[PDB]
Design a protein around this ligand. Structure first.
Ligand SMILES: *[C@@H]1O[C@H](CO)[C@@H](O[C@@H]2O[C@H](CO)[C@@H](O)[C@H](O)[C@H]2NC(C)=O)[C@H](O)[C@H]1NC(C)=O
Ligand SMILES: *[C@@H]1O[C@H](CO)[C@@H](O[C@@H]2O[C@H](CO)[C@@H](O)[C@H](O)[C@H]2NC(C)=O)[C@H](O)[C@H]1NC(C)=O
Ligand SMILES: *[C@@H]1O[C@H](CO)[C@@H](O[C@@H]2O[C@H](CO)[C@@H](O)[C@H](O)[C@H]2NC(C)=O)[C@H](O)[C@H]1NC(C)=O
Ligand SMILES: *[C@@H]1O[C@H](CO)[C@@H](O[C@@H]2O[C@H](CO)[C@@H](O)[C@H](O)[C@H]2NC(C)=O)[C@H](O)[C@H]1NC(C)=O
Ligand SMILES: *[C@@H]1O[C@H](CO)[C@@H](O)[C@H](O)[C@H]1NC(C)=O
Ligand SMILES: *[C@@H]1O[C@H](CO)[C@@H](O)[C@H](O)[C@H]1NC(C)=O
Ligand SMILES: *[C@@H]1O[C@H](CO)[C@@H](O)[C@H](O)[C@H]1NC(C)=O
Ligand SMILES: *[C@@H]1O[C@H](CO)[C@@H](O)[C@H](O)[C@H]1NC(C)=O
Ligand SMILES: *[C@@H]1O[C@H](CO)[C@@H](O)[C@H](O)[C@H]1NC(C)=O
Ligand SMILES: *[C@@H]1O[C@H](CO)[C@@H](O)[C@H](O)[C@H]1NC(C)=O
Lengths: 418, 134, 97, 49, 49
């Protein structure tokens, strides 16, 4: 750092990163009477004396189950119409084959979507189910979520951000990338003159995404954690049926077949207290995890709206670097965003001045910055080194040279003079 | 040879050796699940459909079902008149091949609605109008 | 007394010195490279020109900054000085922690 | 005889404890390299002392 | 019975407070990213004015 030195990049890099967000968790339902008492009427009548705890647990679980479908709907059903990619895949040299749907497979998922689907392994189910616990299928199948992601991809790559604000307005992909470059402070001529290099870098990054997902075992960590937490909670809930809770046995049929009612009531009540406590603990943990998953799903929906359906100026919200675009991919109980961003690469240091003194007038850059390579002075855009002659069109005049601190004498060319 | 009965991960008896024939019998709990009633508002109609959740339609049969034997429950507890969705067995709704916007969510991509015969219909929900950008 | 009954307090992974180092690094990056260090490599720029960029970011031309640099520096220093009294006086300022 | 309540409580507390370190890491460890201020403190007249 | 109930109550309260602290820490991380590492156009997100 010094008071007259600046660093400006002379090249760039297209970087594609992955962000994984849980969206929904397993929808579970619990039969209060079946879990606590099984199929014994004496236990059912004794439990009837405990009030309306069963209805509360049922309502809480139903609310969670509906909220999961709401989360998925909010994250993915953000597109009005199911757009389709054109059969011709000429997008300025950019190659989206690894993220576009693959019609060969029945699921019609992309290559990366298939990698994500295989990478998350589920956690056995029948034993948990046998004690009044059921798993409700999600409202949207995986095929429907894949269709939603395909529609979002087609809209993004055929209409830019226009489809998120109304009707989809087609635009060539190179011109869309030129608009994106304008959005981050780089003139579009940079994109048009480095189109081949930018397409090559984007294709290389997309190719590296596959290895990035496959190598790191903790990459798909959040979705796996959600699945493991659900499975562990269900396993604990089932294991709680083996506890005695101070009774003589943990099996209700043995109590019924060994004791008369007046003595069986004590043991049955001892079992009921513990089983009801375990059920309530499970429901409370499910509520807390559902709140966390809802927060994550709201974040995912916001990222879908602001990173995929538009270009975001928010720093680090859609990846590291200056955000260019984003692509969604479905995943088990979640979403994955491929954020394509622009990163300055090769910086050189130049001498800099805040203003140029000429004929007793102070000239300030209109859109760039004054730089010097040692002998001559130019004006260049801030995010990419592209020196140009200082004229009366690159700069504007404001006052004399007696106020600005660090002003440098130089000549300002006038196009009209020749 | 010394083992009598088997337990699963949850320590629930899932196999047993017969004392006389000395053969190994697997034990599976009898089918159960929730019952859901799909209905338009009573302001619209009194017709309903019944969804037995997570059970094959063949198992649904009034004779052994927890459903009552009242004539209407007899009608709504026969698996012969039942469509098999991934969410379970649906009785009292006709499956159509059209796709509409979801009205009553059944699950696994299946939705139900009331359309003017005026029975309950079940269909695959439509995600939206197909569009191809020029 | 709280600890004596099976309750323990685990120290945080990052010491206060490490968090202070992180904040110092963030401050140095901000005041020596503007917002460039958050998007990639830190590109040095004079602080007056960085403030000119910031003024451009809010709809004010940079000539305003360059012609009122002394006044702006004085106002910034005065506000930083007032921060100390603002923290010390109000007892509810550090309320959340 | 009360089951596995203790393991559940232990797991919950461990998750909270790890989440605290994760929170601090996410808030503060957002810088790639430990930058250092130059010894000279001439920043256009601004005073960050 | 009573001691286990008290322990469970403590753990549940800790979980709720941990969720609140996680929300606050996510907000703090977002403010660090968007107010310190950049200039924010969002109104009142990084102060008045
Ligand atoms: C900007 O950087 C790219 C690399 O990202 C440069 O492209 C490479 O150039 C070297 C020659 O110096 C070739 O061997 C590589 O094959 C090129 N890679 C690609 C992907 O094209 C590019 O030359 C740099 N441009 C400038 C002006 O420095
Ligand atoms: C887009 O990239 C894919 C790879 O992700 C290219 O497909 C490969 O093409 C090479 C050469 O034809 C083959 O050797 C590979 O087996 C192909 N891989 C797969 C998975 O198909 C594809 O050709 C690229 N598209 C364009 C237009 O270049
Ligand atoms: C700074 O840039 C200027 C402009 O490009 C350089 O001046 C040119 O130098 C080359 C020598 O290779 C001459 O052929 C050109 O005629 C010069 N241009 C003009 C307008 O005089 C200057 O050499 C550079 N200084 C450096 C790199 O130290
Ligand atoms: C930056 O501000 C600090 C005060 O926060 C200045 O330090 C004070 O300087 C005066 C005059 O030299 C002394 O009387 C005070 O005792 C100093 N206070 C402290 C806490 O050091 C410092 O001089 C200012 N820097 C510049 C370059 O003006
Ligand atoms: C860039 O920094 C080096 C290191 O001191 C210096 O020698 C060189 O002159 C600088 N470049 C310019 C254009 O000032
Ligand atoms: C930059 O700092 C040096 C060292 O004090 C000083 O000589 C020079 O005048 C300063 N430049 C400006 C433009 O203030
Ligand atoms: C800049 O030019 C003016 C007028 O020609 C002159 O008075 C002044 O000394 C010059 N400054 C430098 C640093 O050469
Ligand atoms: C019990 O008696 C029946 C009668 O024939 C015979 O078939 C069976 O093998 C006997 N089993 C044992 C264990 O003695
Ligand atoms: C229901 O049972 C029949 C007869 O065994 C079988 O063909 C069918 O596949 C079963 N249903 C499902 C959903 O598997
Ligand atoms: C739907 O199409 C299938 C063929 O896949 C056909 O067997 C069935 O009768 C059709 N049903 C209706 C209501 O159109």
């Amino acid at each position: 750092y010094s008071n007259n030195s600046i660093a400006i990049p002379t090249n760039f890099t297209i970087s594609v990163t992955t962000e994984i967000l849980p969206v929904s968790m397993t929808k579970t339902s619990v039969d209060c009477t079946m879990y606590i008492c099984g199929d014994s009427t004496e236990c059912s009548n004794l439990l009837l004396q405990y009030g309306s705890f069963c209805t509360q647990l049922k309502r809480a679980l139903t609310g969670i189950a509906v909220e999961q479908d709401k989360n998925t709907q909010e994250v993915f059903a953000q597109v009005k119409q199911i757009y389709k990619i054109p059969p011709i895949k000429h997008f300025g040299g950019f190659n989206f084959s690894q993220i576009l749907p693959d019609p060969s497979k029945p699921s019609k998922r992309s290559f990366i979507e298939d990698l994500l689907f295989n990478k998350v392994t589920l956690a056995l189910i029948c034993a948990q189910k046998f004690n009044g616990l059921t798993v409700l299928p999600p409202l949207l199948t995986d095929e429907m979520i894949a269709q939603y992601t395909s529609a979002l991809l087609a809209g993004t790559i055929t209409s830019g951000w226009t489809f998120g604000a109304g009707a989809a307005l087609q635009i060539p992909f190179a011109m869309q990338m030129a608009y994106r470059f304008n959005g981050i402070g780089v003139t579009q001529n940079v994109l048009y003159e480095n189109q081949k290099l930018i397409a090559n870098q984007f294709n290389s990054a997309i190719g590296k995404i596959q290895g990035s997902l496959s190598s790191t075992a903790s990459a798909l960590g959040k979705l796996q954690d959600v699945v493991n937490h659900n499975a562990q909670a269900l396993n604990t809930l089932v294991k709680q049926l083996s506890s005695k809770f101070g009774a003589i046995s943990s099996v209700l049929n043995d109590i019924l077949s060994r004791l008369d009612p007046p003595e069986a009531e004590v043991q049955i009540d001892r079992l009921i207290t513990g089983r009801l406590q375990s059920l309530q603990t499970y429901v409370t943990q499910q509520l807390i995890r559902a709140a966390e998953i809802r927060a994550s799903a709201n974040l995912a929906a916001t990222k879908m709206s602001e990173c995929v359906l538009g270009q975001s100026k928010r720093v680090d919200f859609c990846g590291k670097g200056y955000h260019l675009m984003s692509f969604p991919q479905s995943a088990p109980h979640g979403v994955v965003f491929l954020h394509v961003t622009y990163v300055p690469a090769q910086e050189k240091n130049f001498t800099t001045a805040p203003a140029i003194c000429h004929d007793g007038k102070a000239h300030f850059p209109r859109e760039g910055v004054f730089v010097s390579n040692g002998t001559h002075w130019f004006v260049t855009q801030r995010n990419f080194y592209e020196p140009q002659i200082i004229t009366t069109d690159n700069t504007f005049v404001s006052g004399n040279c007696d106020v600005v601190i660090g002003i440098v004498n130089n000549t300002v060319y006038d196009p009209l003079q020749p | 040879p010394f083992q009598q009965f088997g337990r699963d991960i949850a320590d629930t008896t899932d196999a047993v050796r017969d004392p006389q024939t000395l053969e190994i019998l697997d034990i599976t709990p009898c089918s159960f699940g929730g019952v859901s009633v799909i209905t338009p508002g009573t302001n619209t109609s009194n017709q309903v459909a019944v969804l037995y959740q997570g059970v094959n339609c063949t198992e649904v049969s009034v004779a052994i079902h927890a459903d009552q034997l009242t004539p209407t429950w007899r009608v709504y507890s026969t698996g012969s008149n039942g469509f098999q969705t991934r969410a379970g067995c649906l009785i009292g709704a006709e499956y159509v091949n059209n796709s509409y916007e979801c009205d009553i969510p059944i699950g696994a991509g299946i939705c139900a609605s009331y359309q003017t015969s005026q029975p309950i219909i079940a269909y695959t929900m439509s995600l939206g109008a197909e569009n191809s950008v020029a």
